[PDB]
Amino acid sequence: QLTPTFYDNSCPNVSNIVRDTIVNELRSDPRIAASILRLHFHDCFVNGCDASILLDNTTSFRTEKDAFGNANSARGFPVIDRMKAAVESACPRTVSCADLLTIAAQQSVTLAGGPSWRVPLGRRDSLQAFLDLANANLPAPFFTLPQLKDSFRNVGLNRSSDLVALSGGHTFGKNQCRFIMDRLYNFSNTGLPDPTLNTTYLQTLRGLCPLNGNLSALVDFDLRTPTIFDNKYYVNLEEQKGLIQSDQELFSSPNATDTIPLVRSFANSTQTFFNAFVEAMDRMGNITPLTGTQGQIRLNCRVVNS
Ligand code: HEM
Ligand SMILES: [Ca+2]
Numbered sequence: 595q596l597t598p599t600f601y602d603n604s605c606p607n608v609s610n611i612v613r614d615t616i617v618n619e620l621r622s623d624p625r626i627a628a629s630i631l632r633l634h635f636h637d638c639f640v641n642g643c644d645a646s647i648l649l650d651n652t653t654s655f656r657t658e659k660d661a662f663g664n665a666n667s668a669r670g671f672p673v674i675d676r677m678k679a680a681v682e683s684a685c686p687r688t689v690s691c692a693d694l695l696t697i698a699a700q701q702s703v704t705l706a707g708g709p710s711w712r713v714p715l716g717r718r719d720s721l722q723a724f725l726d727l728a729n730a731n732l733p734a735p736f737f738t739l740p741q742l743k744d745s746f747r748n749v750g751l752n753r754s755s756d757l758v759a760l761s762g763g764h765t766f767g768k769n770q771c772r773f774i775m776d777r778l779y780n781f782s783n784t785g786l787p788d789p790t791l792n793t794t795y796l797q798t799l800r801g802l803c804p805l806n807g808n809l810s811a812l813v814d815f816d817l818r819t820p821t822i823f824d825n826k827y828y829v830n831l832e833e834q835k836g837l838i839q840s841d842q843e844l845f846s847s848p849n850a851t852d853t854i855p856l857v858r859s860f861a862n863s864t865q866t867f868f869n870a871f872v873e874a875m876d877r878m879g880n881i882t883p884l885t886g887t888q889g890q891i892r893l894n895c896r897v898v899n900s
């Protein structure tokens with residue numbers, strides 16, 4: 595079983611080294627905290643949190659970095675390399691990349707103003723990467739609520755609270771115009787914008803993402819506090835200001851009878867949201883981990899030990 599004290603003897607300063615690395619990177623890249631949290635999410639949804647997403651291509655298996663949900667989107671890999679090297683220097687062959695990324699995600703959330711907690715540890719690193727599984731398991735912004743629920747249940751998260759709380763990760767970070775073009779100009783082949791998108795915000799988004807414009811242009815997930823980890827994400831949903839389809843469906847989908855009350859509860863209380871986020875984060879971090887002697891303690895997160 596995973597435990598928060600796993601490295602209290604072998605590498606007591608691991609969390610501090612991770613924090614220091616992120617603090618330093620944030621000065622030149624204010625988006626890195628969001629990027630790191632997302633890497634952990636994409637790691638856990640594919641064969642569990644086993645650092646499989648960090649592996650680069652080999653002639654025997656393809657990298658998950660080329661998955662539809664990661665390609666030209668996932669980022670921060672060199673930063674993970676930096677903290678890994680620092681931890682390896684402080685504590686040789688001790689901290690797995692899987693655990694490192696989990697701590698990095700928690701520290702990223704805390705540094706951005708979110709809750710502070712000690713994540714369960716003891717995960718080990720995968721011996722391969724899973725591109726096909728990543729293409730099948732990572733949810734997409736155009737998913738309906740039933741599809742979002744299916745995606746979470748598929749990896750082991752059955753609770754609507756899991757889905758609603760973890761979606762709160764969109765309280766910060768960036769999103770490409772590419773992913774909302776349909777909502778802005780032609781939703782579900784209706785030739786009209788998504789009716790669940792606030793019409794005033796629709797105008798603003800159309801200005802940032804004009805038709806035939808730069809699809810790679812970036813827009814903030816949270817128009818209220820773009821880089822702060824808080825519950826504003828839910829207040830936006832209540833006003834039909836969720837940025838992507840999957841965000842707004844939590845509040846507007848015909849199948850949202852169970853998610854609406856959660857959205858409201860999280861928008862009404864920061865404490866309720868933070869508590870739910872920590873709970874959901876630990877549940878996600880507990881998805882099919884390799885433990886004990888299974889897998890390895892990867893020295894270079896990009897390659898399997900030889
Ligand atoms: C519920 C289904 C979800 C969908 C469909 C989804 C979809 C997306 C999309 C389309 C982007 C934009 C990528 C880009 O434009 O390059 C993104 C970014 C992001 N997502 Fe999600 N996401 C989901 C859940 C989550 C969860 C569970 C977390 C973490 C707890 C998370 C954290 C983030 C963060 C922080 C960013 C910004 C990353 C950055 O700016 O580098 N997402 N997501
Ligand atoms: Ca994984």
Ligand SMILES: [Ca+2]
Binds near residue numbers: 765821824
């Ligand atoms: Ca925010």
